[PDB]
């Protein structure tokens, strides 16, 4: 039996379909039989008879499907047509400031993607704006910063691997940037210190250990991160930073046939492979799971190249099926309940043109029908986002239609004079910055309790996942008073897009010019 690619599997099997199936204790490779394998829940593999690794990453077609492989490659990447490679970005948990009266705020970071969008990781941190201290109005004064002073920046970060394969020795160099181009610092690539592993969906260091301190705390530079006044001003007006990271990972862990040992070979290095993967696969970005950008690459054919025409034709439907988890309970593509029709398709200009052609030779207008007839070619970039939410320039979930917001609140488990304990779907509370509470006199007056832009963070989360809104937090540590059991109690929610991050022109602090959505309205009797 011929086998040109020298990858264990014979040619015909690779072209037509095969599957590995365990017979009591021995595993053997078999040609796909329609009737005996389908009942057993086995996947029909296909691959290239002329490629030692159809995806082009460092694991052979045979190794992947057979399980002889670094046991850390994520499961969904075991299928021969899904490239397995790392994607490391940096997540900053909190910062602190002073001058070479310590501004200590918690931060939230999200992996970003913007638009002709290219293969380079960047993240984006947002510093909390809410006033942890009552008296700390205006940062410029809480820290004695003068026109001729300089502030020091000291943050905590952890690395997150959201890819599909482990990195071993190296940790990426990564540069912090404020504004458009003001590079404050480049985080050194520590040497011979990352002897641990970053498996997919893991943190370094783990959630159980102190996070890696950004400032060295040693003698390398007394304050490496100096920062002039004007810069500090820029930061105060924008409250946003960027973290750009490159692709310099370590070596690769390979499987040895003589004894099954996985040793990090010093010859193979990810910086030689990534270009290959990136130039021969179609890339699909999905924010379905938890509104975070998950990126996968599928091996598609490229007409111009002989060796490349060898790869099995890949239709979009299958791509979604094998890369993310879509299935067919009733033949309708859906991801854990949500039908495929609730998602957007966005394409780069190239891919757009190509798909318009494909839709023309078939005489169809709605791609959601002819979904299983769209051929993927190499280098297409596709963005599938939930259709219900509003988005900003960096494709981060930022808001939503008010009506959806209301349905998300229609389940009042209990109500009293001390607050609400709701049970809301975990995804909505990442596009709500806070709530405005107000009381209405029986004759139409309006009293807003937390009537300051930076006093909205009143919604905490209990250990049983029930959100609890506390009135006494930014009140006077006093219960909630009502001048009339007929006075209505109104609760409003403020979406991210409509929030204010700095005092206005004339330093207005009132919540007047804020687009507010009605979220609750029960009279005194109900409470």
């Amino acid at each position: 039996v011929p086998d040109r690619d020298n990858d264990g599997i014979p040619d015909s099997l690779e072209v037509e379909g095969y599957t590995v199936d365990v017979k009591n204790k021995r595993t053997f490779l078999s040609p796909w039989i329609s009737n005996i394998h389908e009942k057993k829940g086995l996947t029909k593999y296909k691959s290239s008879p002329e490629k030692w690794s159809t995806a082009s990453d460092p694991y052979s077609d045979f190794e992947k499907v057979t399980g002889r492989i670094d046991k850390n490659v994520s499961p969904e990447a075991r299928h021969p047509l899904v490239a397995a490679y790392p994607i490391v970005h940096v997540d900053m948990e909190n910062i602190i400031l002073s001058k070479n009266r310590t501004i200590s705020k918690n931060t939230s970071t999200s992996r970003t993607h913007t638009s002709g969008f290219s293969n380079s990781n960047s993240s984006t941190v947002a510093i909390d704006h809410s006033l942890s201290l009552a008296g700390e109005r205006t940062w410029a004064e809480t820290m004695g910063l003068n026109t001729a002073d300089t502030a020091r920046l000291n943050a905590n970060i952890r690395y997150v691997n959201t890819g599909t394969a482990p990195i071993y020795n190296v940790l990426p160099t990564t540069s912090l940037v404020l504004g458009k181009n003001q590079t404050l610092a480049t985080i050194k690539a520590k040497e011979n210190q990352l002897s641990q592993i970053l498996a997919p969906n893991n943190y370094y260091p783990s959630k159980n250990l102190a996070p890696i301190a950004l400032n060295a705390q040693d003698d390398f530079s007394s304050t490496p991160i100096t920062m002039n006044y004007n810069q500090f001003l820029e930061l105060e007006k924008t409250k946003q930073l960027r973290l750009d990271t490159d692709q310099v990972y370590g070596n690769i862990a390979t499987y040895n046939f003589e004894n099954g040992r996985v040793r990090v070979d010093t010859g193979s290095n990810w910086s030689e492979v990534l270009p290959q993967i990136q130039e021969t696969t179609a890339r699909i970005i999905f924010n379905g799971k938890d509104l975070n950008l998950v990126e996968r690459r599928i091996a598609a054919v490229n007409p111009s190249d002989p060796l490349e025409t060898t790869k099995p034709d890949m239709t979009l439907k299958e791509a979604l099926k094998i890369a993310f988890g879509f299935n067919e309970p009733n033949g309708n593509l859906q991801y854990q309940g949500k039908d495929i029709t609730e998602f957007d398709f966005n394409f780069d200009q190239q891919t757009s043109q190509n798909i318009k052609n494909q839709l023309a030779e078939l005489n169809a207008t709605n791609i959601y029908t002819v979904l299983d007839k769209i051929k993927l070619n190499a280098k297409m970039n596709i963005l599938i986002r939930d259709k219900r939410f509003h988005y900003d320039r960096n494709n981060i979930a930022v808001g939503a239609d008010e009506s959806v917001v209301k349905e998300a609140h229609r389940e009042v488990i209990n109500s009293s004079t001390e607050g609400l304990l709701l049970n809301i779907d975990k995804d909505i509370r990442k596009i709500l910055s806070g709530y405005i509470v107000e009381i209405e006199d029986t004759e139409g007056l309006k009293e807003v309790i937390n009537d300051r832009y930076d006093m909205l963070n009143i919604s905490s989360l209990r250990q049983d996942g029930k959100t609890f809104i506390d009135f006494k937090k930014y009140n006077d540590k006093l219960p909630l008073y009502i001048s009339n059991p007929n006075y209505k109690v109104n609760v409003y929610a403020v979406t991210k897009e409509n929030t204010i991050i700095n005092p206005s022109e004339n330093g207005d602090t009132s919540t007047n010019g804020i687009k507010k959505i009605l979220i609750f309205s029960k009279k005194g009797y109900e409470i």
């Binding site: 014979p10 017979k23 078999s30 039989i33 005996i36």
Partner: protein
């Protein structure tokens, strides 16, 4: 069928077949590479013209041999197909004395030794003219009324043509005719004109084993075969040897009612053979055949047994028999406690059902030990080895082995039956092929013969100088006069057979039989328990 065939032929799927359907793979594996070349011939075997073309093709090669045939050769070949029945006028003219008048008024129909055809023969013989001296003259007469049948002599003697079991003149005649026939078959089948040639022969199951032949055919519908007995027949049928002259056909022809075996025999270019004008071939004697498969087939609404076979040098099969001889002797010398090198279970077989005889030894003895008190076996085996006696399993008639003829010394003293015990040689003989007219299986035949030996040793221990049995002692003859007729009619014959019959029954595998002997002959039971005590 088609599906399995397809998966097996396609190289890449063969392994899948073997993994999920092991048995199917084995069947198809054996099917497509030897039997397949077979079934083609039978298809051709249905067309008249193919039969006639191959027959004619076979003719010319033997044309030269046929054209040179003399009168003596053809006359001999004539005698071989049709036996010559004995002529009454010759025997009558051969007696002429007082014995014939004496014979005149004898209770003919009272001799068990005679068979039906011999009773008929004597009854019509009496157109030319009891517990005494007349059955001995009848014993002699039996050795003179047998038909002149060369082929019968050849299986009965197993190829040992010098057997002094018959009158000397007949012996010279037989040796001469067979040697002349041996000279006649000088042409080998070998040619450049033809490859594998298959020939056929229809055979009656009763010729190989009358024990299986009685229940082979379904009791209700004679067109079906009972699968249970079939599996037994097939179990250990692995090789066979033909010592006599095979009379084979060329084209399959319909068989008679009593022929249920349809042999397909392949030949070797070196096998010597003769051509017959009547579409038959005469093969040389002393041919060895290995059986490749045994199956049930259907033809014209009736069931049959298909048996194939391949001709090979007899020596190759003979080696199997000696190695079997060594395996059984080494195993039982250890199991009994006998000297390491003893020749005890020697068996010599030259017939069609050989392999079953050998394998059946490994069963008769297993049933023999587990059923008899260990100390009796050991003691009697010790007695037997103290002399030159050996057990002997054969597939030829008992009168031709070696030991039996020598010690009796009279020509007429010959006896043939299912089993036999020779005191002079202290040997037990078990003839497998025949079926006991009484016994249910072979094991019982063995135990019966064993009884005669035990009786001899038991009698030997009482006094060393005198040779006598436990019976003949006045303390047992009387016992035979009272209870002797309370069991089977066969044992009523005399004391020796009675003792043997009682011994098997007291040791039968069915406890019910034991109880029967308990409640029917209470005295004998304590007597037997008293002779076996001597240990």
């Amino acid at each position: 069928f088609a599906k399995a065939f397809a998966y097996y032929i396609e190289p890449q799927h063969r392994d899948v077949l073997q993994l999920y359907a092991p048995e199917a793979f084995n069947y198809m594996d054996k099917f497509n590479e030897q039997e397949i070349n077979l079934s083609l011939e039978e298809l051709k075997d249905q067309r008249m013209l193919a039969r006639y073309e191959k027959w004619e093709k076979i003719k010319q090669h033997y044309q030269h041999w046929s054209d040179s045939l003399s009168e003596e050769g053809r006359g001999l070949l004539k005698k071989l197909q049709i036996p010559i029945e004995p002529k009454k006028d010759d025997i009558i003219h051969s007696l002429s004395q007082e014995e014939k008048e004496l014979l005149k008024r004898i209770q003919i129909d009272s001799s068990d030794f005679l068979s039906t055809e011999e009773k008929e023969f004597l009854k019509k013989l009496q157109i030319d003219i009891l517990s005494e001296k007349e059955k001995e003259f009848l014993k002699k007469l039996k050795l003179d009324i047998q038909p002149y049948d060369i082929n019968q002599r050849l299986q009965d003697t197993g190829g040992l043509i010098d057997s002094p079991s018959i009158n000397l003149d007949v012996r010279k005649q037989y040796k001469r005719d067979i040697q002349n026939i041996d000279a006649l078959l000088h042409q080998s089948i070998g040619s450049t004109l033809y490859n594998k040639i298959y020939l056929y022969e229809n055979m009656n199951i009763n010729n190989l084993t009358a024990t299986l032949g009685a229940d082979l055919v379904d009791s209700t519908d004679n067109t079906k075969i009972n699968r249970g007995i079939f599996n037994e027949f097939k179990k250990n049928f692995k090789y066979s040897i033909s010592s006599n002259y095979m009379i084979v056909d060329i084209n399959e022809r319909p068989a008679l009612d009593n022929e249920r075996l349809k042999w397909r025999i392949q030949l070797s270019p070196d096998t010597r053979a003769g051509y017959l004008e009547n579409g038959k071939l005469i093969l040389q004697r002393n041919i060895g055949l290995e059986i490749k498969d045994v199956q049930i087939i259907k033809q014209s609404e009736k069931e049959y047994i298909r048996i194939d076979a391949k001709v090979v040098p007899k020596s190759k099969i003979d080696t199997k028999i000696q190695e079997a001889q060594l395996n059984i002797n080494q195993e039982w010398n250890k199991a009994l406690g006998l000297p390491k090198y003893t020749k005890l279970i020697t068996f010599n077989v030259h017939n069609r059902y050989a392999s079953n005889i050998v394998e059946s030894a490994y069963l008769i003895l297993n049933e023999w030990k587990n059923n008899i008190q260990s100390d009796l076996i050991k003691k009697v085996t010790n007695y037997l080895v103290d002399g030159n006696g050996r057990f002997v399993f054969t597939d030829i008639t008992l009168p031709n082995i070696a030991e039996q003829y020598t010690h009796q010394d009279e020509i007429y003293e010959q006896v043939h039956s299912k089993g036999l015990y020779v005191p002079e040689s202290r040997s037990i003989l078990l003839h497998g092929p025949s079926k006991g007219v009484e016994l249910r299986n072979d094991s019982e035949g063995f135990i019966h013969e064993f009884g005669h030996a035990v009786d001899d040793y038991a009698g030997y221990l009482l006094d060393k100088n005198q040779s006598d049995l436990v019976t003949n002692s006045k303390k047992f003859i009387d016992i035979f006069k009272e209870e002797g007729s309370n069991l089977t009619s066969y044992g009523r014959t005399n004391e020796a057979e009675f003792f043997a019959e009682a011994f098997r029954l007291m040791h039968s595998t069915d406890h019910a039989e034991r109880l029967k002997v308990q409640k029917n002959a209470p005295k004998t039971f304590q007597f037997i328990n008293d002779q076996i005590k001597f240990i």
